[PDB]
């Protein structure tokens, strides 16, 4: 979901 | 190791130390638990994070030279702890580990509240347990009831045209972890809400001049997920 590859970018600014 | 050591270090952190003689040990601690491995975090373990919890808990009861340095090094040592799974599992075991990382995020400490929310943004979006968001914001209740301040206000502060862009970008960030991972419509558009109403909209405004990538990178999911929101609402 669009919600989710949001997520995803959170998590890789992250890392 | 040693494991030897790991032990030491609990029986040193419980010895009732002070000021550069404690903040020695700290730094100590924050090289052995970077620089060994997952193997010797789990020696150290449930005691060894609770005898750091325990210290950490006194530097705010008595209000030291040292006690910025101190409170900082801790952070440093929880965020080497967390840095794997079974460092975030036990921190999250505890009762006061989360409020404790909250109180941490003091804007007047810069570079202790950038480590502090990083960490809390992190254990936001994990996977499992799910809804860290709202454990989180738990302890942001009780700090604010505690320092007499609005729960979001440190954030707010962090976010001031005058602090570094790293803790910008930090305070931004653990906003989008509060946020994005909560299933409940209706309770991302509160959040957001109340974060506008205290200021960030103003705020936001200011923000958006700002050239670095990645303080545009959270500001780019902050809109699409409010614009998301806004779709879903009509
Ligand atoms: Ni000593």
Redesign the pocket.
């Given at each position: 979901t669009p919600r989710s590859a949001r997520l995803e970018r959170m998590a890789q600014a992250l890392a | 190791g040693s494991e030897f050591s790991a032990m030491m270090y609990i029986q040193?952190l419980r010895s009732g130390?002070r000021d550069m003689?404690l903040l020695s040990?700290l730094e100590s601690l924050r090289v052995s638990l970077n620089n060994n491995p997952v193997s010797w975090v789990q020696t150290f373990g449930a005691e060894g994070l609770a005898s750091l919890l325990d210290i950490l808990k006194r530097l705010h009861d008595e209000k030291g030279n040292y006690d910025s340095r101190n409170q900082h090094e801790i952070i440093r040592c929880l965020k080497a702890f967390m840095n794997n799974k079974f460092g975030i599992k036990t921190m999250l075991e505890t009762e006061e580990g989360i409020l404790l990382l909250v109180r941490a995020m003091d804007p007047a400490v810069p570079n202790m509240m950038i480590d502090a929310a990083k960490l809390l943004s992190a254990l936001c979006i994990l996977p499992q347990p799910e809804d860290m968001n709202e454990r989180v914001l738990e302890a942001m209740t009780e700090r604010a009831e505690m320092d007499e301040v609005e729960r979001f206000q440190p954030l707010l502060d962090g976010l001031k045209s005058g602090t570094s862009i790293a803790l910008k970008v930090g305070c931004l960030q653990l906003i989008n972890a509060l946020i994005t991972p909560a299933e409940e419509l209706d309770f991302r558009v509160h959040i957001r809400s109340e974060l506008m109403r205290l200021g960030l909209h103003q705020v936001l405004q200011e923000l958006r001049e700002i050239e670095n990538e990645d303080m545009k990178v959270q500001l780019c999911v902050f809109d699409e997920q409010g614009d998301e929101d806004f779709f879903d609402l009509k």
């Open positions: - | 040193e130390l003689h040990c």
